[PDB]
Write an enzyme that holds these catalytic residues in place. Structure first.
Site, mmCIF file in Angstrom:
data_model
loop_
_atom_site.group_PDB
_atom_site.id
_atom_site.type_symbol
_atom_site.label_atom_id
_atom_site.label_comp_id
_atom_site.label_asym_id
_atom_site.label_seq_id
_atom_site.Cartn_x
_atom_site.Cartn_y
_atom_site.Cartn_z
ATOM 1 N N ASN A 190 0.802 -1.232 0.000
ATOM 2 C CA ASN A 190 0.000 0.000 0.000
ATOM 3 C C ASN A 190 0.839 1.290 0.000
ATOM 4 O O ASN A 190 0.259 2.377 0.086
ATOM 5 C CB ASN A 190 -0.934 0.032 1.207
ATOM 6 C CG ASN A 190 -1.742 -1.221 1.399
ATOM 7 O OD1 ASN A 190 -1.863 -1.732 2.523
ATOM 8 N ND2 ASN A 190 -2.318 -1.735 0.323
ATOM 9 N N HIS A 192 2.953 2.331 2.286
ATOM 10 C CA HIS A 192 3.157 2.809 3.640
ATOM 11 C C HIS A 192 4.461 2.157 4.100
ATOM 12 O O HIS A 192 4.816 1.081 3.606
ATOM 13 C CB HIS A 192 2.011 2.369 4.568
ATOM 14 C CG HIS A 192 0.730 3.102 4.338
ATOM 15 N ND1 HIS A 192 0.221 3.971 5.280
ATOM 16 C CD2 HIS A 192 -0.107 3.073 3.271
ATOM 17 C CE1 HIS A 192 -0.906 4.439 4.766
ATOM 18 N NE2 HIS A 192 -1.134 3.942 3.549
ATOM 19 N N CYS A 227 5.898 7.169 9.475
ATOM 20 C CA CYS A 227 6.909 7.868 8.685
ATOM 21 C C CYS A 227 6.413 7.821 7.219
ATOM 22 O O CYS A 227 6.032 6.760 6.745
ATOM 23 C CB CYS A 227 8.285 7.204 8.832
ATOM 24 S SG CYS A 227 9.552 7.816 7.669
#
Ligand SMILES: Cc1ccnc(N)c1
Ligand SMILES: Cc1ccnc(N)c1
Lengths: 268, 265
Positions: A190, A192, A227
């Site tokens: 995804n 991330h 992050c």
């Protein structure tokens, strides 16, 4: 891998790879964390969860909800050697409206002995606003179908390490590794940042002499903020002591905390 | 995994993991490169290595990677089983070669192929050298004696000359450093990390709208644990092509050069 006879837990065997081991020819803590995440995904799929990267329920999909990691706690007694077969058993449990928990037990496939255990806490968040939420009645009900109803805990001991409060590191840190950035291999499907990367970033500020003369026994990591792909991180460490460290991950620019944690190391 | 009936090649099956896939739920080129390296290690062990020979240890010699060339037709999806076959061949006194064939375990069709060139080096001085008679003899016992090539074609991509990128580069990613997960068991930077570093300077729009078809990477110098790298890319081209260069952030010392060919989805 397969669900157990009762359908309330999942087991999977892994052969330890050449690129997965450290200088002592045994699995790194990041390889362990990756294997824990892999068996977790295989369990979610086997019990009807969505693929698409997000392990969400049908009610979660209708309400734009996702699970977000709040805490990861791992304890290793023996790291499996290069070529060894490690068996991992995993299961989930609902924790009322607070969130959910995924627990793991690691075993030597040859001897059948427990070589490690892990626990993780997950909280509900709206995918769009990124706002935390409590678990709803409908989500708790769909969890009852694949979770043991009596408590089953990897860390049962009252007042144990896995539930301990972690303080915020005070400036100046004794050790540091600054300007850490994620590359494409650090992202999940995804886009991330993968949870295991944060463990790697925490460990980067431990001196190489500690890694060469000590074994990691316990790691407890709190997750506070994600992050982003274009963010830059600073990893800080201070010795609190067996050797013990207090850790902090924050953004290089504004100093925004993303993680905090502790590690306990034993001399070889 | 196991050696084949003749004992001159090795096969292994891999189930594609959740953390190993990209945005389209299929294996990244780095996961492929890692699987190629893993089956290579399993082959060396099955034929008596540990990855030097008995003569190599006696003379303080090691193999060093000179070139990696991979071509993918289909990246395996998350949960799929990919079967990889690998084998080695001696190339006179020049060095050796390891070749790979990737297949869909379900259909039995070839979905990719790779080739790698390795040169001999003294472990202590880091000085290159030719392969000796005794090392060539050791390889004859477990390599096919007739030529077996993953890239048979006479003027194919795997043997093409790669030029050095001219400043200024069109694209760049500056200050790349290896972390502990980027090192191998000997604390040297893993070969697959260099592939990742090369790709970092490709724009995200190219990755989102194109598939990597071919990657050719030359290895010239090793990046140390405390070194910092710059990755540079310039478009050389319905197919997109790039010229790449990895160099040290300080010195400008070249460590790698390569090319990638991408096809629109
Ligand atoms: C617990 C928590 C809260 C918000 N964002 C995260 N990434 C984690
Ligand atoms: C081909 C080659 C030469 C020297 N060092 C390397 N790492 C590679």
């Amino acid at each position: 891998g397969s669900l157990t006879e009762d359908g309330l837990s999942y087991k999977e065997k892994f052969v330890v790879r050449s690129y997965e081991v450290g200088s002592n020819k045994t699995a790194t803590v990041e390889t362990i964390a990756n294997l824990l995440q892999e068996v977790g995904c295989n369990h979610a799929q086997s019990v009807g969860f969505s693929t698409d990267g997000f392990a969400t329920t049908t009610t979660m999909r209708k309400l734009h909800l996702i699970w977000v990691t709040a805490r990861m706690h791992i304890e290793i007694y023996k790291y499996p050697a290069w070529g060894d077969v490690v068996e991992i058993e995993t299961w989930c449990q609902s924790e009322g409206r607070i969130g959910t928990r995924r627990d793991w037990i690691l075993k030597d496939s040859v001897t059948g002995e427990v070589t490690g255990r892990a626990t993780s806490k997950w909280v509900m968040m709206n995918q769009d606003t990124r706002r935390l939420q409590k678990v709803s009645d409908d989500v708790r009900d769909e969890y009852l179908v694949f979770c043991p109803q009596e408590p089953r805990l990897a860390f049962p001991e009252e007042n144990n390490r896995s539930l301990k409060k972690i303080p915020k590191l005070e400036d100046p840190a004794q050790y540091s590794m600054i300007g850490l950035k994620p590359r494409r291999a650090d992202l999940d499907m995804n886009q991330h940042v993968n949870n295991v990367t944060y463990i790697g970033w925490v460990l980067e500020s431990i001196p190489q002499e500690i890694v060469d003369t000590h074994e990691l026994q316990v790691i407890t990591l709190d997750y506070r903020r994600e992050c982003q792909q274009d963010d830059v991180v600073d990893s800080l460490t201070t010795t609190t002591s067996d050797s013990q460290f207090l850790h902090l991950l924050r953004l290089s620019g504004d100093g925004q905390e993303i993680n905090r944690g502790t590690t306990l190391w034993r001399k070889k």
